[PDB]
Amino acid sequence: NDIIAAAKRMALLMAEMSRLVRGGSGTKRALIQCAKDIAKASDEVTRLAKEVAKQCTDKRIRTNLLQVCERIPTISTQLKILSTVKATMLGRTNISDEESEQATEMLVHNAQNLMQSVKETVREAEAASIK
Amino acid sequence: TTALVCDNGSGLVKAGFAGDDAPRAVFPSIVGRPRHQGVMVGMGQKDSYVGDEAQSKRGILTLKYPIEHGIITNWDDMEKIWHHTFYNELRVAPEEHPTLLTEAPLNPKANREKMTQIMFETFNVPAMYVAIQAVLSLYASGRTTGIVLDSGDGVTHNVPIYEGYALPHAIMRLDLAGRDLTDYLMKILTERGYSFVTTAEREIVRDIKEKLCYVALDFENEMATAASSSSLEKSYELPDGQVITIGNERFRCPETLFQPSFIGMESAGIHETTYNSIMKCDIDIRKDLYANNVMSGGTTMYPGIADRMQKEITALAPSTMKIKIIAPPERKYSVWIGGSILASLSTFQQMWITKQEYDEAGPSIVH
Amino acid sequence: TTALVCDNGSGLVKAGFAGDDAPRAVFPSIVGRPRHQGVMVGMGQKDSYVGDEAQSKRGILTLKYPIEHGIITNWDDMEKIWHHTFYNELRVAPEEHPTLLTEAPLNPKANREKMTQIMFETFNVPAMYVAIQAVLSLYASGRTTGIVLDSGDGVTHNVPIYEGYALPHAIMRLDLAGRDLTDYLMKILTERGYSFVTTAEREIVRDIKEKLCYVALDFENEMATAASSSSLEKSYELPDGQVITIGNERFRCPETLFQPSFIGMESAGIHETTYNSIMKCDIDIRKDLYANNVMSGGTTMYPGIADRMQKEITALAPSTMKIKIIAPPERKYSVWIGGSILASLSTFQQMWITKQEYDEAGPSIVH
Ligand SMILES: Nc1ncnc2c1ncn2[C@@H]1O[C@H](COP(=O)(O)OP(=O)(O)O)[C@@H](O)[C@H]1O
Ligand SMILES: Nc1ncnc2c1ncn2[C@@H]1O[C@H](COP(=O)(O)OP(=O)(O)O)[C@@H](O)[C@H]1O
Ligand SMILES: [Mg+2]
Ligand SMILES: [Mg+2]
CATH class of the missing domain: 3.90.640.10 (ATPase, substrate binding domain, subdomain 4)
Structure with a gap:
């Protein structure tokens, strides 16, 4: 089941992202690449969720699956943008530690919202696989 | 293999396969549509949120219980409760298991018919039985005698049962609680x-x-x-x-x-509906209805009961007539632990309504 | 090629194509006519100077901000703002690509219609959408909830959004800053x-x-x-x-x-207007308007906030309530970094006002 495979891949990347955000200035390039890799996996979940929805035999489950998966593009796009912002704050000539910490908290929060939407997408995908 | 005990709660619908311990899923059944407009874009939101999530995300919806005075308001929301619960919670198809559904002891017709009939054509269930929530609480309380209290938001009931038959001439329904x-x-x-x-x-x-x-x-x-x-x-x-x-x-x-x-409602209190139902039964049986008073439902989990209820009955009751009040642990799941005993039992497998027999016979089988 | 995000700043109009870094052209909106007699005899100079040249030649002009109280003075100066930005800065014509324009959360009708209508007949863009500056700052903030503060010279605003619906009765417009x-x-x-x-x-x-x-x-x-x-x-x-x-x-x-x-004006401060928007929303949501406080606009970039804002709110707020008011760097471009995410996404490619609908139905249902 390639949605479950993508979701487990995303979880392993999110475990690596968790390790990277606890580091110092040395995790800068790794953190940007991790976010890029997570966004690539989220696009695969969205593509597969639409395909599973097409193959499903009930309008209601299909509608719910389309509703939840359509937020994944906007949140994954915000993760890519917020990663560019955080990149320009790391190593900046004058920047506050409190502002850096709040940017990290926002980035983790956005990742948590993306993961929660994918978690709900998995629940509806499991339900869609019945019919 | 195993059948499904599914209780159509007053509250507070309960679902779990037959046995062993306690229900796998319990949920408040509420649907609430979003009254405010979305600006995040997509829309990316559900049309109506079911529970648990409609109790974790309040104040942006208008919560509406699907069951109102013990009868379903529309089967359009009810079927959606069922579909959501079976598919994205329990993760089960209704065609896999013979099921067990519940209803109220005294309730309007065609509420059990319309349910049984719609659920057979929509979900395509292979066999079904419909039990009243009160009768199941006897088996859960390990007895076959006593007046049974299934008390939920918003219908309570007082049904008298004696080993092992039902007394129809003394049944009380309160819509007060x-x-x-x-x-x-x-x-x-x-x-x-x-x-x-x-x-x-x-x-x-x-x-x-x-x-x-x-x-x-x-x-x-x-x-x-x-x-x-x-x-x-x-x-x-x-x-x-x-x-x-x-x-x-x-x-x-x-x-x-x-x-x-x-x-400010005239309807008699639980004190008096208990007493007045026992003193509407035949003289000899009254002896064993006392001290088999069996409570059930989540609403009886209050402190101060059962010895308020006991003292109030003992105060009105005849001299040296002893009252014991049967209180199971965790009464909110009593009905479900009842249901588990019923649908698992042999030989009563052939007192179920099966799909093939139902096609020729019609809903006359239910009653 | 790509769509164009042009933000109608209060200040400080901001312009740049869709993504990926920072605005291409920014200037403080000023138009200025020359207030002294000429002796260069050509004369060979602009009729009225726009910015940057109107910020390079102070003391020989009379600077006039074309947007005051959040409403523009006339579309005769406004079209000249637009014409200069598109033609002699960006070097583009709107005929090639759909645009994205911005407006204020609360303003008089029919100034968004008249804007939309004039820009369609003058610059002949093939599709358009008009977004309020506060909603775009949600995308830029990385949040789906929170009260948005878009504060510019001379209209600030307070819009509360909850996952991701708007709370209409709680929106506050201050002409204070x-x-x-x-x-x-x-x-x-x-x-x-x-x-x-x-x-x-x-x-x-x-x-x-x-x-x-x-x-x-x-x-x-x-x-x-x-x-x-x-x-x-x-x-x-x-x-x-x-x-x-x-x-x-x-x-x-x-x-x-x-x-x-x-x-010596009578409107209440950011202190009480923050509180009064939260305390007109339903109980369950009130918790999460707290700690999702997002400031925006260039006028909020003082380092004495947010820990002043924190100390003032924390004194009025209930005990043990989550308070996180720290805002993103570079708030002056927040709205634009927002706009880029919106106009680039599908499904909202199909939520633009198209020229065919504009001709047939006019500026129907713009807001
Ligand atoms: N500790 C408690 N004290 C009092 N009421 C309770 C308690 N726990 C649960 N309840 C009530 O139990 C109700 C649910 O009753 P329930 O047993 O589900 O009715 P039913 O048997 O008919 O399905 C709830 O509406 C709730 O108010
Ligand atoms: N460092 C700063 N501290 C305080 N005010 C600032 C700072 N930098 C810019 N500003 C103010 O920001 C204003 C522009 O706000 P802006 O964000 O452009 O409003 P808007 O979002 O509504 O277009 C300017 O008028 C300027 O005075
Ligand atoms: Mg009950
Ligand atoms: Mg602004």
Whole structure:
């Protein structure tokens, strides 16, 4: 089941992202690449969720699956943008530690919202696989 | 293999396969559509949110229970409860298991028919049985004699049963409890400035109906001792940081089950409907209905019962007639632990309604 | 090729194509006619100078901000703003690509219609959409919930959004900041013996609002330490070399946004207007408007906030309530970094006002 495979891949990347955000200035390039890799996996979940929805035999489950998966593009796009912002704050000539910490908290929060939407997408995908 | 015990709760629908221990899924059944407009874009939101998530995301919806006075308001929302629950919670297809559904003891026709009929054509179930929630609470309480109390928001009942037959000439249905007790609690916390005038916000009141409220042992002396300086008032904390202090009303609200004068409804109290149903049965049987008074439902988990209920019956009852009140642990799941015993039993597998027999026979099989 | 995000700033109009870094063209909206007689005899100069040239030639012009009280003076100067940005800065025609335009959260009708209508007939864009500046700042903030503060010279706003619905009854419009902070700064800079009452020269005052002003942690105690013999004065330099020494007034001017009594106007401060929007929303949501407080606009980039804002709110807020008010760097471009995410996404490619619908149905259902 390639949605479950993508979701487990995303979880392993999110475990690596968790390790990277606890580091110092040395995790800068790794953190940007991790976010890029997570966004690539989220696009695969969205593509597969639409395909599973097409193959499903009930309008209601299909509608719910389309509703939840359509937020994944906007949140994954915000993760890519917020990663560019955080990149320009790391190593900046004058920047506050409190502002850096709040940017990290926002980035983790956005990742948590993306993961929660994918978690709900998995629940509806499991339900869609019945019919 | 194993059948499914699915209880069509008053509250508080319960679902789990047959046995062994406690229900796998319990949920409040509420649907709420979003009254406000979306600006995040997509829309990316569900058309109506079911529970649990409609109790984790309140105040942006208008919560509507699908069951109103023990009858389904529309099967359009009900079928959606069922579909959501079976598919994205339990993760089961209704065609895999013969099922067990529940109803109320005294309820309007064609509520059990329309249910059975729609559920067979929509979900394509292979076999079904429909049991009343009260009868199942006997098996859960390990007995076959006694008057059974299935008390939920918003229909309570008082059904007398004697080893091992039902007495039809003494059956009582009260619509007095429990959502009207919720609505009354909301009116007397509004009386101390704690405003909860909207449908969704009423749910928080229902949670405060669980924990803070209790049954007084003696009303008149608790009213006296409430006027005394030492506190019976408790300070609650609210999601926006607010502190709510309730005290006098705290023991008044559950007492309503004995005293319907608080509501302003004429319907007789549980005290008197218990007594008046026993004293409508034949003389010899009355002997064994006493001391087999069996409670059930989540609404009987209050402190101060059963020895208020006991003392009130013992005060009206004849001389040296002993009353014991049968209280199971964790009464909210009593009905479900009942259902598990029924659908698992042999030889009663052939007293189910199976799809092939049902096609020729029609809904005349149900009743 | 790609769509174009042009943000109708209060200040400070901002323009740049869809993504990926920072705006291409920014200027402080000023148009200025030449107020002195010519002796160059061609004459060979612009009829009225726009920015940057109207910020390069102060003292020979009369600067006129074309947007005041959040509404534009005339579309005769506004079209000239647009024409200059698209043609002699960006080097583009809107005929090639759909645009994205912005407006204010609360303004008079039919000024968004008239804008949309004039821009379709003059510049002949094939599709358009008009977004409020606050909603776009959600995308930029990385959040799906929170109260959005878009504060520019001269209209600030307070819009609450909850996952991800708008809360209509709680939206607050303050005309309190920022051109009135500029005007107040000019009256207490008059206290240090320099003349700034003239229209062009008012821009120099605005620049001293950017760099020099700072927000005190507590007014009464910063006033205490001002009385000390240890200096609190900072030396500013004026364009022809003059030295202005401001100290006390430096923290007096921003304090105005907490205390409107300094202006002598009657509207309530950011302090109470923050609270009053939360306390007109339903109980369950009130928890999560807290800690998702997002500031925006260039006028909020003082380092004395957010821990002033924190200390003021934390004093009025209930006990043990989550408070996180720290805002993103570079708030002046927040809206634009928002706009880029929106107009690039599907499904909302199909939520633009198309030319075919504009011709057939006019500016129906714009807001
Ligand atoms: N500790 C408690 N004290 C009082 N009421 C309770 C308690 N726990 C649960 N309840 C009530 O139990 C109700 C649910 O009753 P339930 O047993 O589900 O009815 P039913 O048997 O008919 O399905 C809820 O509405 C709730 O108010
Ligand atoms: N460092 C700063 N401190 C305070 N004010 C600033 C600073 N930098 C810019 N500003 C102010 O920001 C204003 C522009 O706000 P802006 O964000 O453009 O409003 P808007 O979002 O509504 O277009 C200017 O008028 C300027 O005075
Ligand atoms: Mg019940
Ligand atoms: Mg703005």
